[PDB]
C-alpha cells in the first residue's frame, strides 16, 4: 500500500513491516496520561495519521474522529459542546453523542435525512496506570493486555512518566530501543556515572542464531514480542579497541540494569531493572504520522502503600526524570532523528549493511510483519476506497 | 399499499426510472434483465437522486461521487457509500410494475 | 487535467469544477482598486497562477506577463522602463511595447532577427468603480458586464471596497459564500447585534429540490449565476435543539437582509441587501494559484451626487467596512480555511456528505462545470504543450 | 535518470547535459580553500549530492562518505576520531580509516565478521593553489590539469579568492557566466567607474555561426571548452537604442578587460584579463545538489616573490574582493536566482527562445554533452541498482 | 525573383538542404519522397537551423526544443513553436528545384 | 579437514543449496546447478543472510533479505545492494559423495 512494490519485493523477509510506514491498525496506543485531560474540556491529538477528540465526561474517557462528516473541517478549530453528551461542529451546526458518534441533531436544519443516519468514527479509550489508551481500529477491542509489556499493569506497579513528539517514523525508534550494540551512545550518559551503573560498550556474541532472541508467541493474553538474549552466550565489551590498542573503556560501577530487554507489539520496549535495579522501564514508539511518533515513557516501581508512592514520586521528579529519562535517554532521541535520511526514501530498508547483534532487530521485523493486526493506510485517512467487482 | 409505476414494457433490460410520490421522499425502479427492484431515489451519501445514476447488472452508480449500491439487497458495492438504501418490495401484475409504498 | 482522472470519473456531476483548481480562463477578475496604480509605476501580481505587470500610461492601464521571453525571468526583479511606451527586461535588455507585446527592440544586440517576431502575452485590463479587472484569457474579451453580478455596473452604484489574500483554493471561498447554512457562523458577529439584523441559524427546506435555486443561464450579456431560494418555501430556524432542549437562538433584530443571493461565474457573490437595507454586497473569490485567492470585497449604494458620495464614503470607512467587511465576514475567512485539508488531496470531492441546503452549491458546481469559458492547467502557466 | 524522458527527447542537441542537474561524475571540484581545513579538524560538505567528511592527518588531506555503512547515519552528527588514522561511527563504533575507508574495527564487537570485509566510499583529494579539489568519481583520477582552465595551475599564478553557497542549479551559473549578452546587468557595477573600465552594453555579431566561438577539444592535457569569440566580427555595443534613440550608453574607460572568456568542465569560467589588464578571474560553479552550488571565485595574479604575495593579497582584501569579487559579481547571483522557476520543473530547457549571443551557450551544452565522464544519478547518492 | 537552389537528385528523399541567400535570412528547402517544399531555415522559435532537424511525414522538428512545423503550410504542428514559418513556394522543372523569390 | 565430506550427489536435486556447518569456521553453503555443485560462503557479504535460505535462479543465488545477488560459480556479486565477492569453495565428487575445500580459492 505505502511502499514501491519493487521495495516490498527486495524484503521478503518482512514486507509487511517496511510497508506499515503509518503504523499497525488495530492495537491499543497510549497518547496522553490522565491527568492532562479534565472533565469537559476536549483536546487534540493525531494518532496514525488520524485527528482525535478526546473528552472526559462524568469521569470516562470518549473519542471521536476530529473530522466533521459534513465538509470534512475539524469541530477542534471552535468547540461547540452545547450539551453535557454532544459535541456541535462549528460550521453547519452538525451534533454528535460522544457515546456512539451517532448525527442526533442539526441545529441549521432540524428536519434533515442525515440526522439519525450518518455516524462519526470513534474509538475505544481506556485509562491504565494513569495513562490513556486509544484502540486505532474497528470491531470490539482486545484486552489492553495483549498490547502492554509484562508487568506494567500489575496491582502494585506504581507507573510515572514522560510524553513528548519526536521527528523520526516510529519503527526507527522501536529499533534503536531493541538495538543490542546501541548502548555505545549512553557511555558518557550522566546517569552511568551518577547512579554508578555496570554498562558494557557492546557484546561478542555466542552460540547460535535461535539463541540470541526468544520469540513469544505463547504468551496466555496474547502479547506478541522478543527478548534480546545477546549477553546469556555472549561476552560483554568493556574495552574497546583500534589496531588492538585500548581506546575505550564501558563503565565498572557496582548496579546491574537492562538484564531483560524486550520489544511487544505495537511498539513498546521493556527493559527490566532501569534506571535502578529496583525499577523498571516501559516506553512506546507511537505513530503520529510517516514523520513522527510520540515518545511515551513510563517507569515502574512496586510500591505497597501512599507513604512509598510519594517517596517513589519525588525521586522520580528530582532524579530518574531528569537523570534516566533526559539524561539517558536524550542521547536516542537524536538517535533517531540520524536515520531519518537514510531511510526517508524507503532505500535504507535495502541498503543497510547489518551485523551480528541485528540479529534481534530482524527477529522484531519478522514478529511484527506476522503478528500485527493490520496496516494503516493512506486510504484509511482519507477514508476507505473499494470499487465493485 | 402499492404505487402503480409503469407498463413493464416501458423499460428496456439495464434502465432506471424515479417514481415521485406526493408527501413523501422519491423511490428508483431498477430494470435487470427482466427482474424490477426498487429502492431510495436519494443516494444514503448525500443528496443525489440514483435514477440519474449509472447501472452496471444489479449495482446503481451515483452521480455525485461513484459510490454504488446492490438494487436486489441495498447494501453499498462501491465506497464512499456506507449506509443501505430502503429496498421497496416491487410485484409485477398482468405486465404493469408495481411499488410497495413503505419500504420491507 | 489537474485532478487524478480516477476523482474526475466519480464526480460526473462537476468534473470540469473539480478540475477547476487553477481557476476558469477566458474570464474577467478584479485583482486590486484603481487608486493603487499610478501613473509609470509598474505593479506586480499573480492571477490564474501567472505572474504580470501591470503599468498605467496616459491614464491608461496595460497587462503584460512579468516573464521575458528569452530566459523565463520576472522582468519585476529589476524594472527597467526606459521610454514611457517600454519596458526592458534587466537581464539582456529585451524591450517591450506595453501597448501589443511586441519585442520591439533588444539594447545588447539591435541586429537580432528576433526584433519584430516575437510578443511577450498581454492580457486586457478595464477599470470599473474604482476597480481593476484583467481579462485572463486569448482573443478578443466579451463585455465586463457578463462577468459581473447584475447592478454592480449600475450608472448610480457607488462601488467602496477592501482586498486581501486569503490562503484556500478560491471554490472553498465561493461555497462558504453562496452556502445557505454557513450563516451559522456568523452568529455572535458584532454587526449582527449593533446593526439589529433578523439572523436565522439555518433553514428548514420546503417544496422541491428544483425550488430550491434559480439558474441563470443567459441574460442581456450573457451572465450565468445561481440563486439561493431556500427562505422562498423554507421555515427560518430561530431556536437550535439537541434532543428537543434550546441550547441557541438566533438574533431577532428588525433589518432584513439577504434577501436574495447569487452567485455568477466566474466566482463572484452578490447579498442584496447587505449590510445594511439600502445596500448591496458583491464579493470576489479570484484564483491568485492552486493554495490562493483575493477576497476581493465590494460594497454598493445608489448615490446621486457628490454629497451622498461623500456622505456613502464616511458611513464605509467609519462603520460598513469595519463592522461589516471586517467584522462579519471575518468569520469566512477561518471558515474556508478549516476546508483546506479535507479538500488538499482532491479527496473531499468524493468524500464530503451533503446535506439539503447544499443543493445551492451542486447547482452552482453544475452551473460552473457546464457554462465555464476554458480551465486554467499548469501548462497555460509554464506555456501549452502538444505533440503533432 | 534525472529528468523526465519526454523532456530529454525532445532536446535532442544536449539531452546529456539536461540530465545532468547534479552535475558531472568523474571530475575535479574545488570545495573549500586550504586554509579552511586544519589538522584533526574533520570538515562536512555535500558535492553532487553526497555528504563528504574532509580531515587533514600529518598535513595530508583525507575524504570519506559522511555516510556510517552500518545504518546510514551521518559520523559528523557526533564526530568520534580515536586513533590519529581513524574515524568511529557515534552508533555502534564501527571504525574506519581515513587512508582506504577500510571498516577496520567494531569497538560493540570485536568478533565481527564484517571486519576487514566492508569499505566505506573514498575520494581522492588533492590541494592546489591553496585550493581543496575532490575527485567525485571512481577509479584511478585523471590529472587535476584535465579540469582546470589553462594557467591557473602555472608556476607563478598567485591565486586568492572566496567561496559561498548560492541557491540555483550550477548550470545557471555557467551559463550567466559565460552568456556573452548578460554583460548589461553589470553596466551600473562600482567596478566599472572605480577601475576604469571599458565595457559595452552587448555585441552586434558578425561572421557566421562557426565563428561565434572556439570549441577545444585538441588541448594535450585532455581539458575541454569553449572560448567565446562574438567579439571577433562583432560590432560592440556602446548605444542601447529603443526606436532608434539613445537611452542607455556603455562605459568608456581606458582599461581593456576580458579579452579571452572560456568555459571549462566540469564549470568553470576563465576571464582574462579581469578585473584589471594585469590580473585573470577563474570561477567554479559547483553542483552541492539539484538547487545549489559552491560559487567558488579566484583571482590570479603572476607574483615572483614573497613580497609580490603579500602586496597583492593586500590590494586583494582592500580592493579586488569588496570592488570586483562582491561589487561586480553580485549581480551574477540574483541574476543566476531569477531564472530558478522558469527552469526548476525543466520546463524552461524547452520553451527558453534564444538568440544569437546564445549560440555560446549552445557550444558549451553541446560540449558538457559529448565530453562529460558521467553522469550524477540519485542512485550514486542512495547507492546504486542493478538486477541480474 | 525565382532562385534556382539545385538537381532535384542533389537530394535524397527525406533531407533537408540549407540555401544561404546574401543579404537575407537562409531558407530550408525539404525533399518529402519526390515533392520538394521551402521555409525560413531559423526556428521561428529561437536560433536554431530547420535544416539541421528531422523531418517526419510533411513536417519539419526543430533540433533545439522538438517544436514542429507543417513545411507545406509553415504552421506550428508542435510548441513550443507558436510563431508560423514564412513558406517560398517552389516549382520543379526539368529536373531543376526553383524557390520563389518571396514567401506567398 | 582439507575435504569436508556434505552428502551423496544422489542427496541434491538439481537448483537446490545445502547449509555446511563447521566446528571454529563460518558456515558454507553448496549448490546443485543441473549436474554441476559449487560452494560459497553461506552469509551473505551484505550483512547476516543465510544465502542457502535464498533462491537459487540458474548459477545466481539471491539473498532472502534485501535481494541482493551472487553468481554460485565465481561468487562475484549479480544484484545490488551485494558489492563484496563470496569466498568459493572448491567441490569435488568421488564415489559419489559430494566434498567441499575447508579453504576458499585465493
Ligand atoms: O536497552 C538497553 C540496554 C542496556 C542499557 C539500557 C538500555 C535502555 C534503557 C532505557 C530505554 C531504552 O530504550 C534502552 O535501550
Ligand atoms: O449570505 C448571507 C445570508 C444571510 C446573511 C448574511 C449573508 C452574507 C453576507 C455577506 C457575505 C457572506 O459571506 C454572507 O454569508
Ligand atoms: O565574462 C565577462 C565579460 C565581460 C566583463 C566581465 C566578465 C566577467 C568577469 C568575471 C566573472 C564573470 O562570470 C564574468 O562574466
Ligand atoms: S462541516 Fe461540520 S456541520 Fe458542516
Ligand atoms: S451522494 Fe451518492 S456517492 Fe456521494
Ligand atoms: S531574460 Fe530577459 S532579455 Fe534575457
Ligand atoms: S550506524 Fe554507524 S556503527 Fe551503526
Ligand atoms: S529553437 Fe526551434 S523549437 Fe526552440
Ligand atoms: S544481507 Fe544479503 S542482500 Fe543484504
Ligand atoms: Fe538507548
Ligand atoms: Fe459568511
Ligand atoms: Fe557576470
Same mark, same amino acid.
Not at chain 1, 485531560?37 to 488520524?50: M, Q, R, S, V
Not at chain 1, 473519542?63 to 470534512?72: A, E, F, P, V, W
Not at chain 1, 573503556?249 to 534506571?275: H, R, T
Given at each position: 500500500?505505502?511502499?514501491?512494490?519493487?521495495?516490498?519485493?527486495?524484503?521478503?523477509?518482512?514486507?509487511?513491516?517496511?510497508?506499515?510506514?503509518?503504523?499497525?491498525?488495530?492495537?491499543?496506543?497510549?497518547?496522553?496520561?490522565?491527568?492532562?485531560?479534565?472533565?469537559?474540556?476536549?483536546?487534540?491529538?493525531?494518532?496514525?495519521?488520524?485527528?482525535?477528540?478526546?473528552?472526559?465526561?462524568?469521569?470516562?474517557?470518549?473519542?471521536?474522529?476530529?473530522?466533521?462528516?459534513?465538509?470534512?473541517?475539524?469541530?477542534?478549530?471552535?468547540?461547540?459542546?452545547?450539551?453535557?453528551?454532544?459535541?456541535?461542529?462549528?460550521?453547519?451546526?452538525?451534533?454528535?453523542?460522544?457515546?456512539?458518534?451517532?448525527?442526533?441533531?442539526?441545529?441549521?436544519?432540524?428536519?434533515?435525512?442525515?440526522?439519525?443516519?450518518?455516524?462519526?468514527?470513534?474509538?475505544?479509550?481506556?485509562?491504565?496506570?494513569?495513562?490513556?489508551?486509544?484502540?486505532?481500529?474497528?470491531?470490539?477491542?482486545?484486552?489492553?493486555?495483549?498490547?502492554?509489556?509484562?508487568?506494567?499493569?500489575?496491582?502494585?506497579?506504581?507507573?510515572?512518566?514522560?510524553?513528548?513528539?519526536?521527528?523520526?517514523?516510529?519503527?526507527?525508534?522501536?529499533?534503536?530501543?531493541?538495538?543490542?550494540?546501541?548502548?555505545?551512545?549512553?557511555?558518557?550518559?550522566?546517569?552511568?556515572?551518577?547512579?554508578?551503573?555496570?554498562?558494557?560498550?557492546?557484546?561478542?556474541?555466542?552460540?547460535?542464531?535461535?539463541?540470541?532472541?526468544?520469540?513469544?508467541?505463547?504468551?496466555?493474553?496474547?502479547?506478541?514480542?522478543?527478548?534480546?538474549?545477546?549477553?546469556?552466550?555472549?561476552?560483554?565489551?568493556?574495552?574497546?579497541?583500534?589496531?588492538?590498542?585500548?581506546?575505550?573503556?564501558?563503565?565498572?560501577?557496582?548496579?546491574?540494569?537492562?538484564?531483560?530487554?524486550?520489544?511487544?507489539?505495537?511498539?513498546?520496549?521493556?527493559?527490566?531493572?532501569?534506571?535502578?535495579?529496583?525499577?523498571?522501564?516501559?516506553?512506546?514508539?507511537?505513530?503520529?504520522?510517516?514523520?513522527?511518533?510520540?515518545?511515551?515513557?513510563?517507569?515502574?516501581?512496586?510500591?505497597?502503600?501512599?507513604?512509598?508512592?510519594?517517596?517513589?514520586?519525588?525521586?522520580?521528579?528530582?532524579?530518574?526524570?531528569?537523570?534516566?529519562?533526559?539524561?539517558?535517554?536524550?542521547?536516542?532521541?537524536?538517535?533517531?532523528?540520524?536515520?531519518?535520511?537514510?531511510?526517508?526514501?524507503?532505500?535504507?530498508?535495502?541498503?543497510?549493511?547489518?551485523?551480528?547483534?541485528?540479529?534481534?532487530?530482524?527477529?522484531?521485523?519478522?514478529?511484527?510483519?506476522?503478528?500485527?493486526?493490520?496496516?494503516?493506510?493512506?486510504?484509511?485517512?482519507?477514508?476507505?476506497?473499494?470499487?465493485?467487482? | 399499499?402499492?404505487?402503480?409505476?409503469?407498463?413493464?414494457?416501458?423499460?428496456?433490460?439495464?434502465?432506471?426510472?424515479?417514481?415521485?410520490?406526493?408527501?413523501?421522499?422519491?423511490?428508483?425502479?431498477?430494470?435487470?434483465?427482466?427482474?424490477?427492484?426498487?429502492?431510495?431515489?436519494? &443516494? %444514503?451519501?448525500?443528496? @443525489? =437522486?440514483?435514477?440519474?445514476?449509472?447501472?452496471? !447488472?444489479?449495482?446503481?452508480?451515483?452521480?455525485?461521487? #461513484?459510490?454504488?449500491?446492490?438494487? &436486489? %439487497?441495498?447494501?453499498? @458495492? =462501491?465506497?464512499?457509500?456506507?449506509?443501505?438504501? !430502503?429496498?421497496?418490495?416491487?410485484?409485477?401484475?398482468? #405486465?404493469?410494475?408495481?411499488?410497495?409504498?413503505?419500504?420491507?
Amino acid at each position: 500500500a505505502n511502499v514501491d512494490e519493487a521495495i516490498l519485493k527486495r524484503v521478503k523477509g518482512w514486507a509487511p513491516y517496511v510497508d506499515a510506514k503509518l503504523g499497525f491498525r488495530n492495537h491499543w496506543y497510549p497518547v496522553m496520561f490522565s491527568k492532562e485531560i479534565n472533565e469537559g474540556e476536549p483536546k487534540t491529538l493525531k494518532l496514525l495519521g488520524e485527528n482525535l477528540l478526546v473528552n472526559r465526561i462524568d469521569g470516562k474517557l470518549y473519542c471521536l474522529k476530529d473530522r466533521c462528516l459534513h465538509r470534512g473541517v475539524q469541530l477542534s478549530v471552535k468547540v461547540e459542546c452545547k450539551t453535557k453528551s454532544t459535541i456541535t461542529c462549528w460550521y453547519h451546526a452538525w451534533t454528535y453523542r460522544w457515546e456512539d458518534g451517532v448525527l442526533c441533531d442539526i441545529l441549521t436544519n432540524p428536519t434533515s435525512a442525515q440526522i439519525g443516519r450518518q455516524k462519526l468514527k470513534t474509538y475505544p479509550v481506556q485509562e491504565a496506570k494513569g495513562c490513556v489508551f486509544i484502540y486505532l481500529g474497528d470491531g470490539d477491542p482486545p484486552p489492553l493486555a495483549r498490547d502492554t509489556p509484562p508487568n506494567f499493569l500489575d496491582d502494585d506497579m506504581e507507573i510515572l512518566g514522560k510524553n513528548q513528539i519526536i521527528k523520526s517514523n516510529w519503527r526507527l525508534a522501536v529499533e534503536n530501543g531493541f538495538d543490542p550494540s546501541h548502548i555505545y551512545i549512553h557511555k558518557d550518559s550522566i546517569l552511568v556515572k551518577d547512579n554508578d551503573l555496570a554498562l558494557p560498550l557492546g557484546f561478542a556474541p555466542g552460540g547460535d542464531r535461535k539463541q540470541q532472541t526468544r520469540v513469544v508467541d505463547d504468551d496466555v493474553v496474547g502479547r506478541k514480542g522478543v527478548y534480546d538474549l545477546i549477553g546469556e552466550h555472549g561476552v560483554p565489551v568493556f574495552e574497546g579497541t583500534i589496531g588492538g590498542e585500548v581506546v575505550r573503556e564501558g563503565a565498572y560501577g557496582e548496579k546491574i540494569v537492562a538484564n531483560d530487554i524486550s520489544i511487544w507489539l505495537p511498539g513498546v520496549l521493556k527493559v527490566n531493572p532501569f534506571p535502578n535495579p529496583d525499577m523498571m522501564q516501559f516506553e512506546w514508539y507511537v505513530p503520529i504520522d510517516e514523520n513522527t511518533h510520540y515518545y511515551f515513557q513510563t517507569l515502574g516501581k512496586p510500591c505497597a502503600n501512599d507513604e512509598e508512592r510519594k517517596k517513589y514520586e519525588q525521586e522520580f521528579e528530582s532524579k530518574w526524570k531528569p537523570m534516566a529519562l533526559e539524561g539517558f535517554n536524550n542521547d536516542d532521541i537524536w538517535a533517531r532523528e540520524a536515520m531519518v535520511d537514510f531511510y526517508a526514501d524507503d532505500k535504507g530498508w535495502v541498503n543497510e549493511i547489518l551485523f551480528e547483534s541485528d540479529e534481534a532487530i530482524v527477529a522484531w521485523r519478522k514478529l511484527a510483519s506476522e503478528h500485527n493486526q493490520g496496516i494503516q493506510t493512506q486510504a484509511h485517512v482519507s477514508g476507505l476506497e473499494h470499487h465493485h467487482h | 399499499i402499492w404505487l402503480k409505476v409503469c407498463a413493464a414494457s416501458d423499460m428496456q433490460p439495464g434502465t432506471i426510472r424515479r417514481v415521485n410520490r406526493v408527501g413523501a421522499a422519491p423511490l428508483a425502479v431498477y430494470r435487470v434483465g427482466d427482474q424490477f427492484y426498487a429502492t431510495e431515489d436519494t &443516494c %444514503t451519501h448525500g443528496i @443525489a =437522486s440514483l435514477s440519474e445514476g449509472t447501472l452496471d !447488472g444489479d449495482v446503481i452508480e451515483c452521480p455525485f461521487h #461513484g459510490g454504488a449500491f446492490n438494487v &436486489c %439487497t441495498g447494501m453499498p @458495492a =462501491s465506497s464512499p457509500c456506507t449506509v443501505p438504501l !430502503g429496498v421497496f418490495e416491487v410485484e409485477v401484475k398482468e #405486465g404493469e410494475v408495481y411499488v410497495a409504498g413503505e419500504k420491507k
